[PDB]
């Protein structure tokens, strides 16, 4: 979907995983550094997206992903690759 | 042992593996209807 | 016949075999995916349709059919192939 719609869904998921406010999450924010999200926690975000939106991200790809903008672009890449 | 291992690790692991067949004979879905991204 | 008439007939049968509300029955819905209808239940719909309108849907087409619109097209095709 649209980049704005992608952020809204993902930001809600992070709140469930960690507790970070959806408005707090911005594309500038980084999961590992800004969000303090480890590899295990980032899996939960991918897992919830897998059940909700159907986007599954394995361990190798999740390690590469760093920031929210990267993840949003990564998902929007799949949407672009429709 | 049950609370920390069996209830916390063993039982949840089996449910994911069996998927919908875990709730057999009740027909269930692995995931709901694929939902669109909210505005 | 008309597209609505084909859906209306199919919608009634769905409410019998599966008990799914007619409002849920839309042309874009998928039996396996959206309607959560297994292969056997879809066959029963064809059996009732054959004994009511004469439209005979073989098992080969039933596996091929994915959505309600696909089924309507084949029924319209059989309407064309009359």
UniProtKB/Swiss-Prot annotation, chains A, C:
Covalent link location (Isoglutamyl lysine isopeptide (Lys-Gln) (interchain with Q-Cter in protein Pup)): 77
Post-translational modification: 4'-phosphopantetheine is transferred from CoA to a specific serine of apo-AcpM.
Residues bearing PTM O-(pantetheine 4'-phosphoryl)serine: 39
Location, primary (coarse class): cytoplasm
Gene Ontology biological process terms in this record: lipid A biosynthetic process
One Gene Ontology cellular component: cytosol
UniProt KW Zinc-finger keyword: no
Carrier domain location: 1-79
UniProt KW keywords: Cytoplasm, Fatty acid biosynthesis, Fatty acid metabolism, Isopeptide bond, Lipid biosynthesis, Lipid metabolism, Phosphopantetheine, Phosphoprotein, Ubl conjugation
UniProt superkingdom: Bacteria
Keyword Plastid belongs to the record: no
Protein location: Cytoplasm
Signal sequence residues: none
Recorded GO MF terms: acyl binding; acyl carrier activity
Function: Acyl carrier protein involved in meromycolate extension.
Membership in a protein family: Belongs to the acyl carrier protein (ACP) family.
Name of the protein this chain belongs to: Meromycolate extension acyl carrier protein
Species of the source: Mycolicibacterium smegmatis (strain ATCC 700084 / mc(2)155)
Gene designation: acpM
Full-sequence portion shown in this chain: 3 to 84 of 99
